[PDB]
PDB file of C-alpha atoms in Angstrom:
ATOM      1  CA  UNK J  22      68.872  77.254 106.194  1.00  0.00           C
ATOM      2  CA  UNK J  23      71.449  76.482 109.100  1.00  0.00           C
ATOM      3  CA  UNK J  24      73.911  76.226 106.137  1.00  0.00           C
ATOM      4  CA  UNK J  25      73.242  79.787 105.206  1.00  0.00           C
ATOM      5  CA  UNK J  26      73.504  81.216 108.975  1.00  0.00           C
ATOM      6  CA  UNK J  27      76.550  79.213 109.430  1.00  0.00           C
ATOM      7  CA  UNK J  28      78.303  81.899 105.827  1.00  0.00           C
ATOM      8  CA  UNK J  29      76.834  84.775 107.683  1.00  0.00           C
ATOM      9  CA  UNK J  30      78.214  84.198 110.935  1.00  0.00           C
ATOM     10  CA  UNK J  31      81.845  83.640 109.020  1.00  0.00           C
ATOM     11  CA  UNK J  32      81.110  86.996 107.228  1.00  0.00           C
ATOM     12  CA  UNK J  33      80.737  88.487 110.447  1.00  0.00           C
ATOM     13  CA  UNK J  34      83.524  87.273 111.811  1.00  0.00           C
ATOM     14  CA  UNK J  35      85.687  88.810 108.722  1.00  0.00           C
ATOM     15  CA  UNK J  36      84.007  91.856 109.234  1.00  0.00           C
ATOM     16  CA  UNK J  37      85.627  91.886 112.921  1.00  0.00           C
ATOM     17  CA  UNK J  38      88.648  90.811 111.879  1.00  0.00           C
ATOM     18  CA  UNK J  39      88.631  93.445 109.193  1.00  0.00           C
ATOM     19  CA  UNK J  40      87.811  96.327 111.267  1.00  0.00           C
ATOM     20  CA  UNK J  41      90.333  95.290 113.524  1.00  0.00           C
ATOM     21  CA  UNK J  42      92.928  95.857 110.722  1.00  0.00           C
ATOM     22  CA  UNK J  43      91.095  98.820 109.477  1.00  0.00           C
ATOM     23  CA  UNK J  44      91.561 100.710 112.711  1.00  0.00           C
ATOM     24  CA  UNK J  45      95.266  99.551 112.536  1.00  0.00           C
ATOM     25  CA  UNK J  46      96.172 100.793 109.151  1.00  0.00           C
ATOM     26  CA  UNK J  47      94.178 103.811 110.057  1.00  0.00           C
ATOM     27  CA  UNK J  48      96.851 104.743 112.675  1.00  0.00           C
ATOM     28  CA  UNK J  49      99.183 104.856 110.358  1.00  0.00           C
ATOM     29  CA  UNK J  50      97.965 107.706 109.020  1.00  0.00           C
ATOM     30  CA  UNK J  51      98.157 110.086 111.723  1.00  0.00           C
ATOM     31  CA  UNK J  52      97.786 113.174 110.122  1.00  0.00           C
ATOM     32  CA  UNK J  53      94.932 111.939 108.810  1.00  0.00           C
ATOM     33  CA  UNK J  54      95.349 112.556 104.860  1.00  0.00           C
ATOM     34  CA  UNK J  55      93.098 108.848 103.594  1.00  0.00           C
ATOM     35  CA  UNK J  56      90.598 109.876 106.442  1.00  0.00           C
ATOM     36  CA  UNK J  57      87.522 110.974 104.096  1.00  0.00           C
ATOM     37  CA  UNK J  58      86.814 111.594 100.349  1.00  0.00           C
ATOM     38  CA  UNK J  59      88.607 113.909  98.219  1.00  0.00           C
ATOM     39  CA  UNK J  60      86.283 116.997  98.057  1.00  0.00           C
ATOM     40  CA  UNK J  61      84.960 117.756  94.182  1.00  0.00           C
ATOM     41  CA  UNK J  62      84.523 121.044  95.529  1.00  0.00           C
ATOM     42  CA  UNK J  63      88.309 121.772  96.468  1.00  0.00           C
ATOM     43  CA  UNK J  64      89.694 119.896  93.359  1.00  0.00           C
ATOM     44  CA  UNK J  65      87.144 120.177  90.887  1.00  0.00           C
ATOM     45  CA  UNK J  66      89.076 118.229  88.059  1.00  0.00           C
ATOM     46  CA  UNK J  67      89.715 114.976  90.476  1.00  0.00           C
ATOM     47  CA  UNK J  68      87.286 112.359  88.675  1.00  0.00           C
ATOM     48  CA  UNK J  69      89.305 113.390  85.399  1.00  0.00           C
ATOM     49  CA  UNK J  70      92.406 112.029  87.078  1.00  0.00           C
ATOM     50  CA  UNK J  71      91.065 109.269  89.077  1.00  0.00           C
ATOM     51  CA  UNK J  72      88.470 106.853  88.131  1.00  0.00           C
ATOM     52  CA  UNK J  73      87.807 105.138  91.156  1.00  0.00           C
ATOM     53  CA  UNK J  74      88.554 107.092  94.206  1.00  0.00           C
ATOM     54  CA  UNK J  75      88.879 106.009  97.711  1.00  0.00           C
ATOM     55  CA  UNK J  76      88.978 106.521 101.499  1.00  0.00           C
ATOM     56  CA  UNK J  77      89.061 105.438 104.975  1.00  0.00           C
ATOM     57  CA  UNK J  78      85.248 106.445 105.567  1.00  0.00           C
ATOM     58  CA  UNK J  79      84.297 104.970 102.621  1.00  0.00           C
ATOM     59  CA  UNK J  80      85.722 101.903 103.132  1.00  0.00           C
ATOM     60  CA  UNK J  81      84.477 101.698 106.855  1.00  0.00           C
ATOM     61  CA  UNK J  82      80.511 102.114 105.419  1.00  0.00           C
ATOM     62  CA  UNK J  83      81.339  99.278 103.221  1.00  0.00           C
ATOM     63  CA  UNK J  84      82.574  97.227 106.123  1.00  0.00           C
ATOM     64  CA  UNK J  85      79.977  97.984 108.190  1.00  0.00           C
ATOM     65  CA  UNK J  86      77.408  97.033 105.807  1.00  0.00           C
ATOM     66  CA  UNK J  87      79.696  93.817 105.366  1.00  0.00           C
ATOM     67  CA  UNK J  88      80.453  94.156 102.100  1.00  0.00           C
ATOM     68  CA  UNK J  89      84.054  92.927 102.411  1.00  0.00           C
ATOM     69  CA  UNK J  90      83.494  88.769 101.384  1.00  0.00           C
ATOM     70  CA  UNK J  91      87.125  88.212 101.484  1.00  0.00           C
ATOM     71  CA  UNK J  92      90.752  89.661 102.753  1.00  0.00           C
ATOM     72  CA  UNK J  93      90.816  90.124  98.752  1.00  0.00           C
ATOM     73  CA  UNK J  94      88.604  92.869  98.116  1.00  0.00           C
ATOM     74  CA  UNK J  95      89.620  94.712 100.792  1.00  0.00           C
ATOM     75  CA  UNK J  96      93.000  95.358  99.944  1.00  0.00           C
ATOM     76  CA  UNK J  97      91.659  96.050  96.749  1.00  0.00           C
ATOM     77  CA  UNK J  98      90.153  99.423  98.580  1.00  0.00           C
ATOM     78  CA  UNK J  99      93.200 100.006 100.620  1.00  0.00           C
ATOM     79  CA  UNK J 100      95.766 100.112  97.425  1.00  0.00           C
ATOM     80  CA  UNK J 101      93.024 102.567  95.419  1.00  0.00           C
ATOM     81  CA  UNK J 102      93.681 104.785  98.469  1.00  0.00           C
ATOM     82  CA  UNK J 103      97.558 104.542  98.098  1.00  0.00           C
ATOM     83  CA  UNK J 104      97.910 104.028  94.002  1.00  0.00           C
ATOM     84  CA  UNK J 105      95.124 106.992  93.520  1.00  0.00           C
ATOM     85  CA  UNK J 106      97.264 109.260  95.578  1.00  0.00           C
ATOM     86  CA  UNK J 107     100.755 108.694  94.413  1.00  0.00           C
ATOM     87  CA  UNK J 108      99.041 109.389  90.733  1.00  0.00           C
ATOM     88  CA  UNK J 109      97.411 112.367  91.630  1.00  0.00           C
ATOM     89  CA  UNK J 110     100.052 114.230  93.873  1.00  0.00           C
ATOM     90  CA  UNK J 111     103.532 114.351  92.577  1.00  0.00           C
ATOM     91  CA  UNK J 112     106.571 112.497  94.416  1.00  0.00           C
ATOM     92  CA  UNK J 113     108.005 115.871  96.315  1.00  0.00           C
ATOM     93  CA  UNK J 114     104.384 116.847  98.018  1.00  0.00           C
ATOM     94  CA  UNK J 115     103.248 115.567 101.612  1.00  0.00           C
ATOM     95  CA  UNK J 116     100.483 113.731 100.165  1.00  0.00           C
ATOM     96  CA  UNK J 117     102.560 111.501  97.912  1.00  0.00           C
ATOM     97  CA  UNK J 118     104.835 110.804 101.069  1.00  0.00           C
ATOM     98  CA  UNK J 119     102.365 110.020 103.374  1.00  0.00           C
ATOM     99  CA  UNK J 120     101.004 107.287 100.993  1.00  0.00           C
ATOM    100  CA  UNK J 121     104.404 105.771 100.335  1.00  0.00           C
ATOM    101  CA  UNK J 122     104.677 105.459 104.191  1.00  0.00           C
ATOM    102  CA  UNK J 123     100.997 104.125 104.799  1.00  0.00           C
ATOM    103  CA  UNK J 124     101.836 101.437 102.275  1.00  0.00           C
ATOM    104  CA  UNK J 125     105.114 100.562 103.616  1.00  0.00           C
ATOM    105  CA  UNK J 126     103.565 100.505 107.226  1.00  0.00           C
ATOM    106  CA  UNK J 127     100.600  99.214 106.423  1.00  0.00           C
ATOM    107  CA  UNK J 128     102.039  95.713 104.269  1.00  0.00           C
ATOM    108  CA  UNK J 129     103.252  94.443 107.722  1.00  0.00           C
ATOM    109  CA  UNK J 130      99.684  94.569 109.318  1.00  0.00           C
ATOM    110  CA  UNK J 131      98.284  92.807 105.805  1.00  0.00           C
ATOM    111  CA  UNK J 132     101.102  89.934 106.348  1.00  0.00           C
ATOM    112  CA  UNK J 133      99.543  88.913 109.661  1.00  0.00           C
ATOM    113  CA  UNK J 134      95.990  89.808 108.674  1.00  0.00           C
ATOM    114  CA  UNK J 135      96.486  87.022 105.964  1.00  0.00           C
ATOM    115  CA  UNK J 136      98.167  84.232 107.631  1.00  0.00           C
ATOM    116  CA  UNK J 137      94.962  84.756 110.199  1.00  0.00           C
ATOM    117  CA  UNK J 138      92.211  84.721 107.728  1.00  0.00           C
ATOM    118  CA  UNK J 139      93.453  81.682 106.213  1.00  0.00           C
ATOM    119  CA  UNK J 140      94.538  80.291 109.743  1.00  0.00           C
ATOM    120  CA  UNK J 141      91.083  80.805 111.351  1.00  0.00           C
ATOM    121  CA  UNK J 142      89.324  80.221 107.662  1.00  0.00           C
TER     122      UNK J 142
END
């Protein structure tokens, strides 16, 4: 149906909107800590602690594959990286620091990101 083109071409257009912000909150992460998975090799116990665990990478294969349908579930991924970490690591470690400053950074990029996906629909 033209009806059903007409959704995919708006979920593409989130996706590129998305990524956009993706690559922004990415920066602000310079030393890279969110970049990929937590290896289960170098902490063994980590799926004891954390039930759901996240990353940059991971969330890029789901946008790729547009699997982001709203501004919603993306976020969702983006706090699991944050809220895992400042569980895991404790308050006077690098790790715990960098999230609180990803986070802090990162809320003003969501602001905007908001305003334009309801803006643009």
């Amino acid at each position: 149906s033209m009806e059903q083109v007409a959704m995919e071409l708006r979920l593409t257009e989130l996706t590129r909107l998305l990524r956009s912000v993706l690559d922004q909150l990415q920066d602000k992460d310079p030393a890279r800590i969110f970049a990929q998975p937590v290896s289960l090799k170098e902490v063994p116990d980590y799926l004891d602690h954390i039930k759901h665990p996240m990353d940059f990478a991971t969330m890029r294969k789901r946008l790729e594959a547009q699997g982001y349908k709203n501004l919603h579930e993306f976020e969702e991924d983006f706090d699991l990286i944050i809220d895992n970490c400042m569980k895991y690591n404790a308050r006077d470690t690098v790790f715990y620091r960098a999230a609180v400053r990803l986070r802090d950074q990162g809320g003003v990029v969501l602001r905007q990101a908001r305003r334009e996906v309801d803006s643009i629909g």
